[PDB]
Amino acid sequence: SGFRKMAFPSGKVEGCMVQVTCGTTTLNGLWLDDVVYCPRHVICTSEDMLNPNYEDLLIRKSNHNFLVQAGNVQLRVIGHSMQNCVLKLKVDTANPKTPKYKFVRIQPGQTFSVLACYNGSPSGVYQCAMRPNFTIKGSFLNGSCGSVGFNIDYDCVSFCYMHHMELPTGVHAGTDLEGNFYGPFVDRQTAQAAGTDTTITVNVLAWLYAAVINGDRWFLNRFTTTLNDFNLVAMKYNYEPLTQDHVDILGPLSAQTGIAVLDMCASLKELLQNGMNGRTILGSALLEDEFTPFDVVRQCSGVT
Amino acid sequence: SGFRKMAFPSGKVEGCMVQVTCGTTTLNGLWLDDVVYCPRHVICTSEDMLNPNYEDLLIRKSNHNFLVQAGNVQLRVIGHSMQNCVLKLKVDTANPKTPKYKFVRIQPGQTFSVLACYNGSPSGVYQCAMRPNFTIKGSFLNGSCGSVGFNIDYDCVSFCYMHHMELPTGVHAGTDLEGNFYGPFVDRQTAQAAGTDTTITVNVLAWLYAAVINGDRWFLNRFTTTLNDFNLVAMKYNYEPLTQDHVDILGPLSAQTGIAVLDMCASLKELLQNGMNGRTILGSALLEDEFTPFDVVRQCSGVT
Numbered sequence A, B: 001s002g003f004r005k006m007a008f009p010s011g012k013v014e015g016c017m018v019q020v021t022c023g024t025t026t027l028n029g030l031w032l033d034d035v036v037y038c039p040r041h042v043i044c045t046s047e048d049m050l051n052p053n054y055e056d057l058l059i060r061k062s063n064h065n066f067l068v069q070a071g072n073v074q075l076r077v078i079g080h081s082m083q084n085c086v087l088k089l090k091v092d093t094a095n096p097k098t099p100k101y102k103f104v105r106i107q108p109g110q111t112f113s114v115l116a117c118y119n120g121s122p123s124g125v126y127q128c129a130m131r132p133n134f135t136i137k138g139s140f141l142n143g144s145c146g147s148v149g150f151n152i153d154y155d156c157v158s159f160c161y162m163h164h165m166e167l168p169t170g171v172h173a174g175t176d177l178e179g180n181f182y183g184p185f186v187d188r189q190t191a192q193a194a195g196t197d198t199t200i201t202v203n204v205l206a207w208l209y210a211a212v213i214n215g216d217r218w219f220l221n222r223f224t225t226t227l228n229d230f231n232l233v234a235m236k237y238n239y240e241p242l243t244q245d246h247v248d249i250l251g252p253l254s255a256q257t258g259i260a261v262l263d264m265c266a267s268l269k270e271l272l273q274n275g276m277n278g279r280t281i282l283g284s285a286l287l288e289d290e291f292t293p294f295d296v297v298r299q300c301s302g303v304t
Ligand SMILES: CC(=O)Nc1cnccc1C
Pocket: A049, A140, A141, A142, A143, A144, A145, A164, A165, A166, A167, B001
């Protein structure tokens, strides 16, 4: 019992983290096989970042201008290409610690572990979600770019995020490992305002199921609702619409707890309309939306 | 920018996790050099746990009754002793992945990363604190016992916690790596009620400093207070007393932000008396007390 914001174990990903230096810019790279992945803005001065032409900036760079370091050993760079907003540096040595991995582009509402790195050295690991506005609310200083977001399925690391940008609002934008930004964000020091950070309704429900499973039941009410009726209230509260798909996804938690998804929705409805009145749920004063249904099942069942 | 509940990278500790089986009981062990540490209740049936005599239970156990597995390779057990509430199984092979490590007994209010394991396999990593009632609010199922709590100082893992007990209230008790329980808890399925879970006042202040540093300033007020005056209010709100030591510990955050500790206290005072009024601080509706001043400095500065 007890329910905690839980990152995947970082070990497998620690073994992939290198330091990438181009001129005076140092950030983090992901070393998988004989490729090192890093943000392409490693080639930018902070001045460049105002209006960078990455193809043009790149012409002035050779393999030997990319200094790649794993621990205190330098990797030889034998090739470089730009894929979207990432650089792929071909090194002459396949990472001996390469885990089984995939590159996956996650949907808004999907959670993942971030291994925050500085100079290719891990500082910590936290759990995030891809927000519906395709931002993430990370913890990232200067030098944290190239820090990656991942899921582990038993022994296979699915890389879903590379850290690129702080927005003027101190939220975060980055890419999948093909270099494509989540959302409409760009690797440029320009006006970039996030849209509405809506609450991930299915995640809140998953977490209400987690709460019931761990003995926090005070918010279970006598009401049910409909998808359409619940959704009117969701809209009003900047909650994502709930789909039949979300309901199906919650089925196993519905099954285990014997609370119909729509009854739980009616509980969530009342929590929205009526607030917490100073009570907590799993030690939170707000409705947590950074546990997926899969996160809840995993943590409630003890998958490894 | 952005501030996140951040565990240390788990890699170094993943490399230490083994499966300990005694008869029908399987839980987690910590393999450091040629010793495997696990809770002594590995030798108990759930029936034993009602009133176990561990010395007597132990007499009926030999080295070969302790089945230790690292990945899918069995370790040969060549000795066993009981130290307080842990077993130390001497194995014939020193863990090749033994990191630099210490055993440290932490104080209430100290935070640490937990690597939750099942059958010696890591499932996740979260950040906890030793509560003032010497419980922790973990996430632990059956088979999670022997999961450890740690800090990393650069490359040296300080092991501070081994998981032992769920209390009937679904909070957690365990030992340091010398087998001594935090608090008055015992490895017995008996009535064990925790005392007052008071808020770690210095940790809340550290986190209010973190918030100011990350642009959440709305709660900064025009008031100051005294230790004695603040403490009257702390008492009333089940907050730990604030000591001059706590003030000194917060000095560097005081320095960096230019907010005197006592002014921040006067801010905290008002937050207690007046609540959040539906506002959040670093995306929390309650005052977070599981970041230490050292946690805040680390995460705000980017130590690795
Ligand atoms: C270009 C950029 O945004 N770099 C960055 C990323 N994350 C956190 C802080 C910073 C300065």
